[PDB]
Ligand SMILES: *[C@@H]1O[C@H](CO)[C@@H](O)[C@H](O)[C@H]1NC(C)=O
Ligand SMILES: *[C@@H]1O[C@H](CO)[C@@H](O)[C@H](O)[C@H]1NC(C)=O
Ligand SMILES: *[C@@H]1O[C@H](CO)[C@@H](O)[C@H](O)[C@H]1NC(C)=O
Ligand SMILES: *[C@@H]1O[C@H](CO)[C@@H](O)[C@H](O)[C@H]1NC(C)=O
Ligand SMILES: *[C@@H]1O[C@H](CO)[C@@H](O)[C@H](O)[C@H]1NC(C)=O
Ligand SMILES: *[C@@H]1O[C@H](CO)[C@@H](O)[C@H](O)[C@H]1NC(C)=O
Ligand SMILES: *[C@@H]1O[C@H](CO)[C@@H](O)[C@H](O)[C@H]1NC(C)=O
């Protein structure tokens with residue numbers, strides 16, 4: 001059963017730069033020491049991705065409320081998370097997000113992943129109430145407060161956790177790409193230790209595929225599931241939550257682009273070129289080479 | 295040498311084109327379609343490749 | 345009478361109930377018809393020293409032919425070469441002198457086909 | 473001179489097929505080998521999805537007095553991967569078995585469970601004399617004769 | 621189905637037509653000549669053969685077909701069926717079922 005939270009008050013949007021992030025392997029074909037051009041849905045290079053704190057302290061009094069905005073799903077989504085305490089737990093995907101239409105749910109607790117396709121009656125503020133045990137504190141018991149009821153379940157998937165245990169400046173970068181093509185929900189992912197970089201870091205990490213769900217549902221909009229360590233009945237003055245939402249998550253939107261990927265001898269995509277970024281990249285794509293002579 | 299290499303490379307890439315057929319793979323079209331339609335698709339591929 | 349009615353749905357939707365995928369024995373180092381995870385082809389298979397990343401199934405170094413592929417049952421990586429082909433040439437003096445001929449097989453070994461192996465191919469019927 | 477007359481190839485004689493291990497066993501034993509079958513008005517529909525379905529076990533078991541398939545032949549069903557399959561498990565009298573097929577009438581075909589004229593699927597039943605009958609009479613299976 | 625390039629029980633098991641046919645197919649309704657009140661089952665058809673027909677092949681074999689794994693030995697039974705079923709031509713049949 002769900003619990004009502006406070007009004008989101010429509011916080012103004014904030015943007016940040018995505019320096020060469022969101023590149024995934026498009027095929028399952030081993031390619032070695034060659035340059036391949038693919039036209040698919042990628043996140044454009046140096047794009048504006050909108051970033052939200054998991055917990056935002058903005059009121060004069062010092063109110064702590066989850067920034068859990070309801071966000072569209074336009075032809076794929078690049079979802080990055082910089083956290084250190086496992087306060088982001090999963091996502092919900094759907095068109096109406098009520099009992100009328102089917103929807104996809106992904107949650108991650110300490111042991112396994114729960115993926116369900118059902119007609120959930122989600123509340124306005126879905127979340128997981130997280131509590132430690134009195135003696136061990138090694139794992140984190142979770143109370144699911146996402147949906148009031150579920151009916152007409154047509155899918156069920158359990159596997160190893162999507163999110164590693166994060167149990168103090170050891171922030172972690174989790175990068176995922178979600179696509180919904182031809183009735184398949186494709187998930188690409190990569191995990192990287194980060195250090196002293198508040199925003200998205202500069203570099204190249206290729207997203208290896210995780211899983212393809214034959215969900216066969218329509219997805220237009222999505223939301224993020226967060227873990228509440230504090231109490232909704234009694235909100236503390238401060239420090240009841242996790243350090244005023246130091247962790248954050250970034251979302252950018254995939255668009256149709258042609259990329260030139262460079263597979264190295266060991267089969268990994270080590271570099272990419274976005275043909276529509278600048279005239280140099282256009283020349284590189286036309287010549288099918290990373291270097292251009294005079 | 296470069297030109298000759300290009301001359302071959304493009305040629306082989308022309309095997310991946312549909313030329314209006316359902317598939318650029320003759321074996322896939324046959325393993326799918328009976329003769330009286332696989333023949334039309336194979337004719338399209340033959341025209342393109344020739 | 346114990347009765348079960350199995351209603352089968354065939355729609356323009358991805359299939360979740362599927363029949364058995366009958367497979368056969370592996371034949372290595374031989375010219376055979378192969379069907380690996382839906383790729384059908386004709387060729388010989390050899391053991392390869394390539395390393396595939398876990399999400400990778402096939403291989404294309406030249407981007408126009410699948411040189412290597414991972415076997416579905418056993419996770420070994422095996423490559424693929426085309427079954428030896430090549431033109432056949434007849435080397436002849438004018439028939440107005442003799443009807444004896446030699447046969448040259450271009451760019452093939454003398455095992456796939458008074459034999460002389462040259463860089464041009466396998467020559468049969470002509471003395472070295 | 474030299475003349476290119478023909479082309480040399482090696483035609484293959486044998487074909488090999490390799491597929492990954494058969495894993496996702498479809499629920500069939502829980503339907504056909506079930507200990508209890510519901511009444512003819514609380515009919516059991518069980519949805520079967522996300523599993524590989526072996527049908528030779530059923531069609532070549534010779535324990536089914538009815539194998540009647542409409543829209544599909546019973547021998548090519550192994551060569552198809554459907555979106556879903558609904559397994560309908562019950563018990564019914566023998567003289568009424570001929571009523572489970574599309575386009576038919578009768579107290580079962582009209583007042584229990586109607587099959588549309590455009591069915592695609594299979595009806596299969598087996599004699600449950602030694603499983604569902606008792607000496608004093610098994611009246612746990614209920615039947616309607618009247619509806620509006 | 622009586623045309624080249626088509627598939628089905630007759631184009632495969634009763635009359636195979638080659639894709640290169642030259643000639644004309646003619647057919648008309650025969651309700652008042654062939655159909656009887658009690659049904660004329662003098663016209664028999666096949667539902668199961670071992671393989672598809674080659675064009676203009678006329679197979680008149682009555683061997684009992686093997687649907688299962690055990691041999692039939694010319695005898696019906698479990699997964700053993702005669703090759704030919706009868707047609708219920710009746711003068712009250714619909715457009716689909718009249719001869
Ligand atoms: C990205 O956002 C900045 C403001 O932070 C803006 O100046 C710039 O034009 C934006 N670029 C794109 C491509 O939207
Ligand atoms: C994780 O969640 C599932 C339900 O989503 C629950 O059944 C399971 O017990 C949870 N894990 C643990 C270790 O309790
Ligand atoms: C690829 O990996 C091998 C060891 O597995 C190593 O010898 C080689 O240098 C590597 N190449 C790269 C990507 O540096
Ligand atoms: C298939 O099963 C064999 C054992 O019979 C095992 O060695 C192999 O790894 C399995 N392959 C897959 C893909 O599960
Ligand atoms: C070629 O053969 C012809 C007979 O067909 C003969 O007249 C002629 O002398 C021969 N010439 C030579 C050079 O062998
Ligand atoms: C193929 O030809 C080479 C000569 O280049 C020779 O060394 C080799 O033994 C031949 N292969 C076989 C199987 O005889
Ligand atoms: C050529 O002479 C060498 C000895 O010098 C001999 O081994 C070889 O067999 C000879 N080849 C031919 C074709 O006579």
Ligand SMILES: *[C@@H]1O[C@H](CO)[C@@H](O)[C@H](O)[C@H]1NC(C)=O
Pocket residue numbers: 500501502504505529533
């Ligand atoms: C039911 O159990 C028997 C064991 O005697 C087995 O032969 C048969 O295949 C089973 N049926 C199903 C549908 O699993």
